[PDB]
Design a protein around this nucleic acid. Structure first.
Ligand SMILES: [Mg+2]
Lengths: 678, 105
DNA sequence: CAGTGCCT
DNA sequence: AGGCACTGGC
């Protein structure tokens, strides 16, 4: 086993030069540095470890170092270099698994200050190295009277860079040993820094292997990117911008502008008692000016101020439909009486309350709908074009949006998506969802050889949450619930268990139950509120004792205040439990998450074993994984058919693999884009 | 004796009026405005026949102030034949107002 | 940073 | 429930 790290001239997307690399070998206990001209030797050293059936540890190597080495080897040496997945370990991937209860700066992309909770020390140092190296580079520069430029610290190799590279390997080595010292994931009897790759994966908790396969495949997914119709979105942007203007014109006509105090420095005090009046707006008292200009032997002072004569400076403000404050201000002046405020005094002004607002003036009452449409349109404009993470700002030269994915960013094992978040694209059911969705699709990618558009295969795990629920209650009801889902009508049954009217109510209740939801939204289906809500969620449980037994068994295991603050996941990992009441949900969300993770892994593996190639230069390409669904680009219709059938096969395999008490299934759909494939 | 203006009556009461008109742009939430208010009452009783004092509350009539670039209140505009002759901002004392008036009148 | 909304 | 991120306002 060896531990390594490299320094290059840019992010994966545009890297062209290998600056240096360092290698620590456990079999020799020595650190070896490789400078710019030792690149070939560095690569030879990595392949030598592969030839021995060894292991290579990088911190974040799955997303950067490894693909970067493949790229740089070809560019700089015209050499084919591909480290096999099974020979690579990633301490970032391991940390996110073992310290899943903690956040991280995602290697410097997020500012520490904003992250809640604490941060593992070694992982923190590794993620701040670029910024630290940068700060030191500038220091030395602005120390020799030399101007600093954007990011020149990465342009050329230098010893300061070599020293940081060496330090990265010492820290990575320490993180590794720290991670391997966790007996839950790594049996104590085995020295994991002294075993071959097959032993490493086979003797450690299944979760270790799964997270590494997930990171490897998702790294490939990011590189593939999601074909995006830039033109279609620019046109939608023009359309939305026009509706925004028109709604602004109309709202500015309805709610005129006004004045507000601003820039007051001195406190206002009663002229009589001199008593400070804090509630009164701040004033300003000029120390110069009079009715007549200063004499010299008297001409009028043109100025507008008079020493000692105080005034309240003010600003002119125009109604802004995006301001919750303006809306609150204008609506109450229309007779609206806020029924619910925030824990800061401000009255709640969300779509639901605006929906309830009733004012006498008919034009103002109608303006509310214009305000609701305005806020929604701003939400779309922000996500598609104007926001910091807007689609139009992220589409790349290859015509694709390469969204980032943290394979295990959520406590439950779910992945997190960002830059931009492709797991929060408006659905087809919401306003403009059809156009937003249609903009992401295989059809927007033209085959490199034939120029023909690709086809998309969209596949999702059918009623995954309910099935996970069925599985866990099987030890209390013997598969009754699982049997009803597969043959009967679990929804109707739930409609009977819970004395609810329509069958859809239950179909909305259950998901509210699984995905957590107060008695408010709960009873909000039965007209009432959290009132009948409490009654409803109780009558349900009453008629479905297996769920009550389950909840109780979870409690007994965690609360004796805690006996253990974690729950065991499907692959054996520890799943931190934030609160006792959210325990069942954490369990269900985690099973779905882990089932979906192994599923997409097994699907890709089966495709490759069937001879299909993963890549735009191949037969298929993973474009997105949104929790319980995957969108895959396919070179042909026939291939899309194979991907769909293979995904179904993989899901069955996963269900059998973890002896699931409820049969698992998938539904697939073929089409040109995300709108049609869901 | 003070003329209380509105956005819609401004043009005829002020701009098309004959004689000197002192307009006070004010708001109920301004301390200084409340300070000069009494002063204006006494000024209206004194300058009758030479000048008319008028008030425009900027919250009830928001269209006029903007046109004159008001940045502080209370703002006093002395109009003569449809145009601003002089302008002072701040709670002037009774004494300071008389000088302002006498000098510009 | 507060208040909200989009997704599974 | 778990996430990301936009806009307003200090
Ligand atoms: Mg590195």
């Amino acid at each position: 086993m060896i531990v390594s790290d490299i320094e290059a001239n840019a992010l994966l997307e545009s890297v062209t030069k290998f600056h240096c690399g360092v290698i620590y070998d456990y079999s020799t206990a020595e650190y070896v540095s490789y400078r710019p001209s030792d690149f070939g030797a560095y690569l030879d050293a990595l392949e030598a470890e592969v030839a021995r059936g060894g292991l290579i540890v990088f911190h974040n190597g799955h997303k950067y170092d490894v693909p970067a080495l493949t790229k740089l080897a070809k560019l700089q040496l015209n050499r084919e270099f591909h480290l096999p997945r099974e020979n690579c370990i990633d301490t970032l991937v391991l940390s996110r698994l073992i310290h899943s209860n903690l956040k991280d700066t995602d290697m410097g992309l997020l500012r520490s200050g904003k992250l809640p909770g604490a941060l593992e020390a070694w992982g923190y140092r590794l993620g701040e190295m670029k910024g630290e190296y940068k700060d030191d580079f500038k220091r030395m520069l602005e120390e020799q009277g030399e101007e600093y430029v954007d990011g020149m610290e990465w342009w050329n190799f230098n010893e300061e860079m070599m020293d940081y590279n060496v330090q990265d390997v010492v820290v990575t080595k320490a993180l590794l040993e720290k991670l391997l010292s966790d007996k839950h994931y790594f049996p104590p009897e085995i020295d994991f820094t002294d075993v071959g790759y097959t032993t490493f994966w086979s003797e450690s908790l299944e979760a270790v292997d799964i997270e590494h396969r997930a990171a490897w495949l998702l790294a490939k997914q990011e590189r593939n990117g999601f074909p995006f119709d830039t033109k279609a979105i620019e046109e939608l942007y023009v359309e939305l911008a026009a509706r925004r203007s028109e709604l602004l014109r109309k709202l500015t006509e309805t709610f005129g502008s006004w004045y507000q105090p601003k820039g007051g420095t001195e406190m206002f005090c009663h002229p009589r008692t001199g008593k400070p009046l804090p509630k009164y707006p701040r004033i300003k008292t000029p120390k110069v000016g009079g009715i007549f200009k200063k004499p010299k032997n008297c001409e009028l002072d043109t100025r507008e101020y008079v020493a000692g004569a105080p005034y309240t400076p003010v600003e002119h403000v125009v109604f802004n439909p995006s301001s919750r404050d303006h809306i609150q201000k204008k609506l109450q002046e229309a007779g609206w009486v806020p029924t619910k405020y925030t824990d800061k005094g401000a009255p709640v002004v969300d779509d639901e309350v605006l929906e309830g607002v009733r004012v006498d003036d008919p034009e103002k009452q109608a303006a509310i709908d214009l305000i609701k449409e305005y806020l929604m349109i701003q939400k779309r404009i922000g996500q598609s074009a104007e926001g910091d993470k807007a689609w139009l700002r992220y589409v790349a030269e290859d015509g694709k949006i390469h969204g980032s994915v943290n394979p295990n960013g959520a406590v439950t094992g779910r992945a997190t998506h960002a830059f931009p978040n492709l797991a929060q694209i408006p659905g087809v059911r919401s306003p403009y969802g059809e156009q937003c969705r249609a903009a992401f699709g295989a059809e927007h990618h033209l085959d490199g050889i034939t120029g023909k558009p690709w086809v998309q295969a969209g596949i999702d795990a059918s009623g995954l949450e309910l099935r996970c629920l069925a599985h866990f209650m099987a030890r209390f009801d013997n598969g009754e619930y699982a049997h009803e889902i597969l043959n009967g009508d679990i929804h109707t049954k739930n409609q009977i268990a819970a004395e609810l009217p329509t069958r859809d109510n239950a179909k909305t209740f259950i998901y509210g139950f699984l995905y957590g939801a107060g008695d408010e939204k709960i009873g909000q289906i039965v007209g009432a509120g959290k009132e009948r809500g409490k009654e409803l969620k109780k009558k349900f449980l009453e008629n479905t004792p297996a769920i009550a037994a389950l909840r109780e068994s979870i409690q007994q295991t965690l609360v004796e205040k805690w006996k253990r603050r974690w729950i065991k996941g499907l692959d054996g990992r520890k799943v931190h439990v934030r609160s006792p009441h959210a325990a069942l949900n954490t369990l269900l969300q985690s099973a779905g998450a882990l089932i979906c993770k192994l599923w997409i892994i097994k699907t890709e593996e089966m495709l490759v074993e069937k001879g299909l190639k993963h890549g735009w230069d191949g037969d298929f390409a993973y474009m997105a994984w949104v929790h319980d669904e995957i969108q895959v680009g396919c070179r042909t219709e026939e291939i899309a058919q194979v991907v769909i059938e293979t995904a179904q096969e993989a899901m069955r395999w996963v269900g059998d693999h973890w002896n699931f008490r409820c049969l698992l299934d998938t539904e697939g759909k073929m089409g040109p884009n995300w709108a049609i494939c869901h | 004796k003070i003329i209380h203006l509105t956005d819609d009556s401004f043009d005829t009461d002020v701009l098309k009026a004959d004689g000197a008109i002192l307009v006070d742009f004010w708001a109920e939430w301004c301390g200084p405005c409340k300070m000069i208010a009494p002063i204006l009452d006494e000024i209206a009783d004194e300058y009758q026949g030479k000048l008319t004092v008028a008030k425009l509350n900027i919250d009830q009539n928001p269209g006029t102030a903007p046109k004159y670039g008001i940045r502080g209140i209370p703002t006093l505009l002395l109009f003569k034949n449809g145009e601003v002759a002089a302008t002072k901002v701040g709670a002037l004392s009774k004494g300071q107002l008389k000088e302002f008036l006498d000098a510009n009148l």
